[PDB]
Amino acid sequence: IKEMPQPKTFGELKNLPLLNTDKPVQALMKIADELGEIFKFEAPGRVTRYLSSQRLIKEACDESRFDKNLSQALKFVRDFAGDGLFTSWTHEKNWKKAHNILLPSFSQQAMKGYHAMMVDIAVQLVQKWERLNADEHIEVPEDMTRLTLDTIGLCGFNYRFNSFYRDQPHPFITSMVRALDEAMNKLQRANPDDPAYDENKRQFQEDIKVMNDLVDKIIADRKASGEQSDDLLTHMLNGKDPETGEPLDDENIRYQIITFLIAGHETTSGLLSFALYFLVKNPHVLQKAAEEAARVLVDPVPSYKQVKQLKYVGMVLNEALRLWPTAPAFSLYAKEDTVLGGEYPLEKGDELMVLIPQLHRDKTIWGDDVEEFRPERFENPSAIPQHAFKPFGNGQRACIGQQFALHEATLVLGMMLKHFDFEDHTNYELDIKETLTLKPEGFVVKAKSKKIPLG
């Protein structure tokens, strides 16, 4: 057996102070560089092991040996996402029921139906950019977040956040962003029962209240209406689990819509923000992506068929997902006593953190140029070893939204490369802000129209 490495210690507090930082994933990536494919992490009441190699993670991805664990991050989000699919244990009845009912709604076939609604928000973004005055710049994450939140709103619940009509975000979103921020702040908050956080707790309960009232209202209205809008809310009110014959209740539907609205905010827009960033830093890659867009997107508004044809744009999103996965870690627990890589023995209940950005830089898999933006790496999926590329997590607890997120990102990116030339006018220096997700903070561009009509 190997004694696995541990990073620097702080007497009683062990390693806890290393997560007392505004960029913990990046801090943890630098520790991985030093310590390698596994290190232990202790804190007063807990212990976790961080994996970085395809070698160890491919075993952790064995669902017969490891199941999804709720991280302290997920337990904190659970306070408003409840037993939604994202913050439920594999063994909760509402996980499997909601999973069986919703999978058909998130299928690559179901994308045919969402396409029109997605095109409606993508067109809103293109027109915003066509209507900019000369020398006016684009705030990339902010406009990408407008598109992604509006798209999950419209396609899911037939609800228009109308993000391209406002400076200040919708009220639901104000409360959701503040709630997610409270949840992320609680991780490194020592003495959280101190009365200084009474305004945090009071505000937290209000933000929860806002989210529940607005979503429960959406759900009440829809049932009272009787309208059969082809969308997630409809599928969830009419759906029945093949296994147990039961439908989701109204409270659990709410949790799913809250989970979807979290997922489709900065988590999804992150992918577009990192993609456009990599594209403008790598002009020969942008040029090739734009040539595909122009060749494939011959109609004034793209069809579902043409999006499937944007293969190089698909490879660009995968390569952005390799370097900066916007849900950068997920937690597993050993279902039984077991041995990882023949070296490190684990007792039943032991937790693993998978460090996805570090997996994606494993040079044994990707070779020596792992820091380079080469979409060509993804030309053949059969040449890529098992469990090498995990931006969407693993097995039955993988991202149900993967097809939706990739379809919207392919459509939108395609339309952006067809309609505009891009300028990195500030020569932007990457600064990755860490919240519940990752985003290139302050990332700005200019977009010259090619003056191609949408009509």
Ligand SMILES: CC(C)C1=CC2=CC[C@@H]3[C@](C)(CCC[C@@]3(C)C(=O)N[C@@H](Cc3c[nH]c4ccccc34)C(=O)O)[C@H]2CC1
């Ligand atoms: C909501 C979803 C998308 C998220 C999942 C996450 C999982 C791992 C997280 C995360 C990336 C945020 C930063 C801490 C980190 C890396 C983590 O190890 N956290 C461990 C260990 C830990 C850190 N601080 C703690 C305080 C108490 C207990 C455990 C911890 C944990 O959350 O459990 C975080 C992002 C948000």
